[PDB]
Amino acid sequence: GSHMVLPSEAPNAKEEILGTVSWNLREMLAHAEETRKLMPICMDVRAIMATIQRKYKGIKIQEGIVDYGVRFFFYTSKEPVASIITKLNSLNEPLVTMPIGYVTHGFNLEEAARCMRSLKAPAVVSVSSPDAVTTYNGYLTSS
Numbered sequence: 001g002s003h004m005v006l007p008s009e010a011p012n013a014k015e016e017i018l019g020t021v022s023w024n025l026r027e028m029l030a031h032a033e034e035t036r037k038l039m040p041i042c043m044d045v046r047a048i049m050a051t052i053q054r055k056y057k058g059i060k061i062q063e064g065i066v067d068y069g070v071r072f073f074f075y076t077s078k079e080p081v082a083s084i085i086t087k088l089n090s091l092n093e094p095l096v097t098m099p100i101g102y103v104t105h106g107f108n109l110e111e112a113a114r115c116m117r118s119l120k121a122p123a124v125v126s127v128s129s130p131d132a133v134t135t136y137n138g139y140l141t142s143s
Contacts, residue, residue, distance in 0.1 A: 004057065011035070016094065018122065020137050022130035025051055030071040031096055031124070038093040039070050039082065046075040065091075081105055081115045088121050094125040099136065113139035135141045 011034035023031075030038050043049060043061055053059050056069035060109065066072035073091070075084040081101025088095070099103065102112035109127075113136050127136055 017096070017124050020125040020127065020133045020140070022128075022133050023126040024128060028096055028098075028126055029055065033057060034086075035094070035096075036071055037096050038091060040073045040075060040088065040095060040097050040100060041066075042077065043074055044104050054092060077104070080138075081107070081112075085115065086121045088119055088138060092121045095119075095121055096126070097123060098126050098128075109136060110143075112136075112140050114143050116140075116141070 010127045013034050015068065016035055016037075017031065028039070029052070031037065041048060041052070043063075052070075052072075053061070059066075059068045061070075061074070063074050063076070066074050071093075073088070075087070079087075084100065097110040099109065099116060101115050102109060107115070109132065116125070117140060125131055125136060
């Protein structure tokens with residue numbers, strides 16, 4: 001059985017956020033939707049996917065630039081952090097994401113942050129702790 005009606009709504013925020021923040025996932029999906037900003041995601045992290053694909057029904061994982069509610073970019077477990085960054089160079093869109101090559105691909109916060117300066121596109125970053133926005137910003141300042 002099927003029926004799909006919901007409160008669709010129009011975001012109109014002229015503004016935009018920069019730097020790292022201490023958001024999580026739903027906060028991010030809101031701002032992403034709001035601004036139509038681009039969201040790099042890794043299908044590897046099924047925990048993230050089990051939220052997205054449920055918030056944006058009927059989707060059944062894809063690869064590539066996933067226009068599905070939010071503008072996503074689905075890059076593999078197998079593509080290195082410098083390679084996905086090189087790809088994102090062509091797009092050069094304002095992003096909002098978590099520190100990408102931090103945990104799915106086995107890094108540390110430092111190694112993540114360094115690699116992320118090599119991204120030549122704007123990117124709001126979200127760490128799952130406030131006390132780490134400081135640390136992460138610190139790497140972005142110090143390397």
